[PDB]
């Protein structure tokens, strides 16, 4: 009576694990080569279906992480290698001693000062201390003027060059220098080869969205209760392409996110305590970073004919520094409240027992905030900021860190260990002129880790890759499989 029959054109689907297409608006270099133009169609349809969503185990997020990394690698691959520069450089000894790369016992310093010296210093747009780059507590950038002998395309001829390094980028040989001209090498050369990131990478914004290939679609969880892991999402929305993603890399705070809403969301890994906290856009949180001074850039041709960009500054500018604006105190109070009320949190309900904290250890990769300003990476020391935003009673944090300020001192580093799991070191060319960047702050990347009903520690994290799981995350990629079977009586002849 009842035959299997075949129903073609069926409204049904299954999990897909395939590559997606990228589409963009910036087609000056990368976009034309790899992407389709952005169609501009961001519409979606709602479906009366229930579906399972996860952000840390998806195909949409795991392509964003791998694709951003891979497009970086194919951009630097053909650039000048700096192994010809891994030679002893002759560096000014005073500056190597002052910044601590080398040692001296002839400085016999002794300081007497007031210990009850903690200050509170606030800055805003209408202030001369910002315009003049001289906020209370800022010092000089730390740069070691070094000379070296380099050979160009003429082979049997060479010239001496003037290069000024940030201290962060030098090693410096120590012991029995009773004169001047210390002997220094680049910080990451000897275990590896440093390649220059020459094709304007990080000098502009990279934004793109993903599109499903024919026969495939993206489902999205459009709930407000979505917390990264949700086995049964009742509001499922279907579309062919994702929202536009900002492929920005930083630690501690994420900047310029697309998921900027008038709400605080916290995504938690289902099998872990790692979270991404979005921040409420209501408070207009913003970070404004500055690189004081006016840089000169001098191209150097090295042997193979490829060019290295040197930095012969021959001057002593103030430290790069960052200014935090917007209602940070209130945005942070909401983060604490959002954690207290969250479904996965069973800790303290006392918001005065929940605190922001730096990750521990002496490792700069986690203890400093790392941010990108148009091509130069900055590493910020944030104790002044954290003490301020939490209105912390400093009291015993050593004189220098006992201040409450809405700005932090920072330093420039040119030899960068990149963000993916590679261990690759690249050199970031200096930017000519002065730099300023004004970014929005959209997320706080942190682990929440408590062991009792008192002290919760929101520990700032350096796992920059997870930022992509806030940008996407709520997407699922599915395959439409429109052939069904079902018993019915309608047999042919």
């Amino acid at each position, epitope marked *: 009576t009842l035959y299997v029959t075949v129903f073609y054109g069926v409204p049904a689907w299954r999990n897909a694990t395939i590559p997606l297409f990228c589409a963009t608006k910036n087609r000056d270099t990368w976009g034309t080569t790899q992407c389709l133009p952005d169609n501009g169609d961001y519409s979606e349809m709602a479906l009366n279906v229930t579906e399972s969503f996860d952000a840390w185990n998806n195909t949409v997020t795991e392509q964003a992480i791998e694709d951003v990394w891979q497009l970086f690698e194919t951009s630097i691959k053909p650039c000048v290698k700096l192994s010809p520069l891994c030679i002893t450089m002759r560096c000014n000894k005073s500056e190597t001693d002052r910044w601590g790369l080398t040692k001296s016992i002839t400085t016999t310093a002794s300081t007497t000062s007031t210990t009850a010296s903690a200050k509170v210093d606030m800055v805003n747009e209408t202030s001369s201390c910002i315009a003049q780059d001289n906020c209370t507590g800022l010092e000089q950038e730390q740069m070691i003027s070094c000379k070296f002998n380099m050979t160009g395309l003429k082979r049997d001829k060479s010239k001496e060059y003037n290069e000024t390094w940030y201290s962060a980028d030098l090693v410096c040989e120590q012991g029995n220098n009773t004169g001047n001209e210390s002997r220094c090498y680049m910080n990451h050369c000897n275990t590896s080869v440093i390649q220059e990131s020459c094709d304007k990478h990080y000098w502009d914004a990279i934004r793109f969205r993903y599109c499903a290939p024919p026969g495939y679609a993206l489902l999205r969880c459009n709930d407000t*209760n979505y*917390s990264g892991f*949700m*086995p*049964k999402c009742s509001k499922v929305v279907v579309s062919s392409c994702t929202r536009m993603m900002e492929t920005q890399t930083s630690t501690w705070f994420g900047f310029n996110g697309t998921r900027a809403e008038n709400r605080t969301y916290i995504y938690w890994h*289902g099998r872990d305590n790692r979270t991404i906290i979005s921040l409420n856009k209501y408070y207009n949180l913003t970070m404004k970073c500055r690189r004081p001074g006016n840089k000169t850039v001098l191209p150097v041709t090295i042997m193979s004919g490829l060019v290295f960009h040197s930095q012969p500054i021959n001057d002593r500018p103030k430290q790069a520094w960052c200014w935090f604006g917007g209602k940070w105190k209130d945005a942070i109070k909401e983060v604490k409240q959002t954690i207290v*009320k969250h*479904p*996965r949190y069973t800790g303290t*309900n006392n918001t005065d027992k929940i605190n922001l904290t730096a990750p521990g250890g002496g490792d700069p990769e986690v203890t400093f905030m790392w941010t990108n300003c148009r091509g130069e990476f900055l590493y910020c020391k944030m104790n002044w900021f954290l003490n301020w935003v939490e209105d912390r009673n400093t009291a015993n944090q050593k004189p220098k860190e006992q201040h409450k300020r809405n700005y932090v001192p920072c330093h420039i580093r040119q030899i960068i260990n990149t963000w993916h799991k590679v261990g690759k070191n690249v050199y970031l060319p200096p930017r000519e002129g002065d730099l300023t960047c004004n970014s929005t702050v959209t997320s706080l990347i942190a682990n929440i880790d408590w062991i009792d009903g008192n002290q919760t520690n929101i520990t700032m994290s350096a796992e920059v890759a997870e930022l992509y799981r806030l940008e996407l995350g709520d997407y699922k990629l599915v395959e439409i499989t429109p052939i069904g079977l079902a018993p019915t009586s309608c047999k042919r002849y």
Partner: antibody
Amino acid sequence: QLQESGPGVVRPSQTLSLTCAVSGDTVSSCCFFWTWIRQPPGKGLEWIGNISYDNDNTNYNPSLKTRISISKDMSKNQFSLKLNSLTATDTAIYYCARESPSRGNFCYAYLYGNCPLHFDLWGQGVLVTVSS
Amino acid sequence: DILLTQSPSSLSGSVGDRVTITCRASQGINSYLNWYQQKPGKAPKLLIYFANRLQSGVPSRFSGSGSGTEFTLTISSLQSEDGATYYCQQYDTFPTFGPGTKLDIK
């Protein structure tokens, strides 16, 4: 803890109201739902609806989609039912409960199907008769 | 919705015996099923929650487990005080409750 209250006798085609007071707690406490179930004499337990939900969102048993309304009042530490178009089949013991979530690594959202949820705390129950 | 049924509808045993109730569903419940104990004249109380957790305040003689479409409540030693109607609740979606079963005392 949960004390319900209302008229023992209501008539067909009238609207029933039942108000439950919360003692030793409030109606704005985090992550709780204020719910009601019914037990017609001789029958099992029927869930009818849910509102602390910290929000103005509700969930109702679809069979009463156009008949049941639930609200809360923080100045009284009370929550209540309004059930319209009463009939004989609405005779039941009406009960309150908290439907507390088990917060922790098994709770993702305060939604059915996405968090352990249970009625740990129950009220006394009010028997309401619909008659002429 | 999910149809939750219970069996036996009427069962008994002597005080000190092992007595069990089985709940079944037309659809799988991932694990989201509770058990309640109701005595005459009283509101039901939570006995077990989320398949495998005993509710605090409930005696250790009560236990249970389950998944999918089959769940079990066990009283390891029936007490004279356990005469009650027991109920299953699925809360996988808009909770509907099962019909309940009765445990009598011998």
